[PDB]
Design a protein around this ligand. Structure first.
Ligand SMILES: [Ca+2]
Ligand SMILES: [Ca+2]
Lengths: 167, 167
């Protein structure tokens, strides 16, 4: 009772022979691969899940539950509408127009670029451009948009976006 | 982070569906964790599979299958008894007395130290000491046991063992 799997076959009886410790990663296609083969620029799993772009981008960024916590702590320190200063009015009321802090944490973890993030979140041209200008300004030490404490709390996170190809 | 996943409840031990892209690694206990939480010194699976010592050793060493192809290439180039020069007489006839090339390649990948490898392969004290002397000689450029060409073929592999705690 699993979609993909119906059409390749059906194992033994019972199900489980999980992966060995030396090839500990199970692909949906049901091959076992070494951690080294994940995100290595070539497909080791027949379904190519080992090179899944969402999985490989998330592997480069903070774990989603740390980003969730981090978004929540900025709004607790700076206000429930604080993230309007970065993403525009869809960020008001604890990211209510962007699908909530859980959906935003996953999107910032998995989405390779600001452009693909903007499109998922339905930001217009002006909101996307302002998001990039604020994030460049946070890296600069600029306080045109954020206060000094706001920029310092955000700086390390924006640095990691930039080191991982977001902008 | 997944609205689908709330309303099926508890991810059993195991299968049915796969772990999401942001927490792609499945513990046998049925938890899903980020790659970054593997081998990080604290348990994120309730069964501590993320800190499993064999898994974590193997993740620092060449993949199983490369080590296996490597040992087979050494014995095709240098003879079916070539690895007697490292492991002693149990290595004769393509590692017959050590359970064969697949078992030796798994043991070299996932055994933390030369002493634990020796005890599992049932090498005696004399054989263990000579193995360590030969491996040191390979790092040195000594040709007392291997030719220049044999040692050149083995040197990177011996360095990967030294760098990952083997001796
Ligand atoms: Ca790969
Ligand atoms: Ca861990």
């Amino acid at each position: 009772f699993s979609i993909r799997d119906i059409i390749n076959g059906k194992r033994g009886a019972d199900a489980a022979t999980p992966c060995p410790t030396w090839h500990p990663f199970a692909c949906p296609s049901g091959e076992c691969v070494p951690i080294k083969y994940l995100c290595d620029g070539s497909p080791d799993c027949s379904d190519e899940y080992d090179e899944n772009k969402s999985m490989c981008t998330a592997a480069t960024r903070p774990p989603v539950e740390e980003t969730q916590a981090f978004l929540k702590a900025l709004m607790s320190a700076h206000g429930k509408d604080f993230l309007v200063k970065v993403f525009g009015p869809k960020a008001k009321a604890e990211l209510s127009g962007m699908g909530g802090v859980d959906k935003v944490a996953v999107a910032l973890s998995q989405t390779p670029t600001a452009d693909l993030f903007a499109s998922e979140m339905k930001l217009d041209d002006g909101e996307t451009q302002h998001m990039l200008e604020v994030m460049e300004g946070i890296l600069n030490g600029s306080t045109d948009e954020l206060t000094s404490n706001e920029a310092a709390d955000f700086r390390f996170f924006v640095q990691k976006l930039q080191e991982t190809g977001f902008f």
